[PDB]
């Protein structure tokens, strides 16, 4: 189902990175957040939901994800939370390692890695990148 996303917090360089994956496509969005809090998580989720048609979000029982602020954002946006990507975290961290030297700050490196992940040609022919896939899948669904 094209409305399903997984969200998770992972950790690198002593910082927190919130990762969202579109399950059907493998498309990713990620951002370094100042602290592993409900407030930061809710803002991230609200931005995500204004951009893609988000219906259900699967997370673990981490305190940021079970927070009242996240519950409120999901309620406002009409998102169903399921409690309850690890390979995605691994792939994202791998790409981060590949570009890390091209930025001073991890926050910039993370966005470079998202770009690379979503846009890189897969299987030796155009049209099968994560970013091309999510667009095709969502368009076909509507």
Ligand X SMILES: Nc1nc2ccc(F)cc2s1
One symbol per residue from 13 to 52: x for binding a second copy (CB under 8 A), - otherwise; what is it?
Answer: ----------------x-x-----------x--xx-xxxx
DSSP 79: P
Residue 111: which of ligand X, a second copy, none does it interact with, CB under 5 to 8 A by kind? a second copy
Residue 97 near a second copy by CB under 8 A: no
For residue 21, the minimal CB distance to ligand X (Å) is 20
For residue 37, the minimal CB distance to ligand X (Å) is 9
Pairing type for strands 56-58 and 4-12 reads parallel
Query: Which among 9, 25, 7 has a CA at the least distance from the CA of 17?
Result: 9
Residue 87 near a second copy by CB under 8 A: no
Q: How far is CA 136 from CA 16, 23, 141, in A?
A: 31, 14, 9
Q: How far is CA 77 from CA 12, 107, 110, in A?
A: 30, 26, 26
Among 12, 23, 24, 77, binds a second copy (CB under 8 A): 77
Residues that bind ligand X (CB under 6 A): 11, 14, 16, 36
């Amino acid at each position: 189902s094209p409305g399903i996303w997984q969200l998770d917090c992972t950790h690198l360089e002593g910082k927190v990175i919130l990762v969202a994956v579109h399950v059907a496509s493998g498309y990713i969005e990620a951002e370094v957040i100042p602290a592993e809090t409900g407030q930061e998580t809710a803002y991230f989720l609200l931005k995500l939901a204004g951009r893609w048609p988000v219906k259900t979000v699967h997370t673990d029982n981490g305190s940021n994800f079970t927070s009242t602020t996240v519950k409120a954002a999901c309620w406002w946006a009409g998102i169903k939370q399921e409690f309850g990507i690890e390979s995605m975290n691994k792939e994202l961290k791998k790409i981060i390692g590949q570009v890390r030297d091209q930025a001073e700050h991890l926050k910039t490196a993370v966005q470079m890695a998202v770009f690379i992940h979503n846009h890189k040609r897969k299987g030796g022919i155009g049209g099968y990148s994560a970013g091309e896939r999510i667009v095709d899948i969502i368009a076909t669904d509507i």
